[PDB]
Amino acid sequence: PSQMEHAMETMMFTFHKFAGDKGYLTKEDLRVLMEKEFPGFLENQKDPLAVDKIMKDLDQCRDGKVGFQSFFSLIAGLTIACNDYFVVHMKSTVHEILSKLSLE
Amino acid sequence: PSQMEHAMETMMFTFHKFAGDKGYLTKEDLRVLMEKEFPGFLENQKDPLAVDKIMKDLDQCRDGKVGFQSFFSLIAGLTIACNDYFVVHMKSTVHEILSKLSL
């Protein structure tokens, strides 16, 4: 029992919970996901098509499905950009840090 | 208050905790890290140089420092490969799943 492993665990159980036996995510899957787990961002965002454009930047294949790999990337782009915040605007919490900065 | 955000939070506080004002990680930083947080893997691994070789595959620049970006990737390679396990050997827990499959 650790932290990272406790985290990686969630991260791993946060994909299929929004996918299923199908094992992937469609445009409507991402949308509902980012609004069924971490709405503290997309909500106070600056566009109602954010999910649409994000979905596009995700499935570089444009078929509809989104695998765990490309998926994780999404869980990264946010964390990465979020991390950079510590390097400046600093030095449960992410719930706000996310809805705060956004980049096209 | 959510799950992913609660996770991303840890993920974010699990880097600098092993870095500091320096804001990065050296070969000795990774080693101690993977043994100060998730030892359930590198330990029952198949090589004592795993960290050395992994470190190499991480800082594609070979200077010594490892930024959060390249760092996260590490937190990915494990999770990704781990995920693939569900697709077969299935269908706190990671503590074991990690030490189980490797390159």
Binding site: D57, F72, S73, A76, G77, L78, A81 | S73, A76, G77
Partner: peptide, 10 residues
């Protein structure tokens, strides 16, 4: 596993 560079961030 194979920790390879990811693709795209934000």
């Amino acid at each position: 596993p194979k920790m390879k560079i990811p693709k795209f961030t934000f």
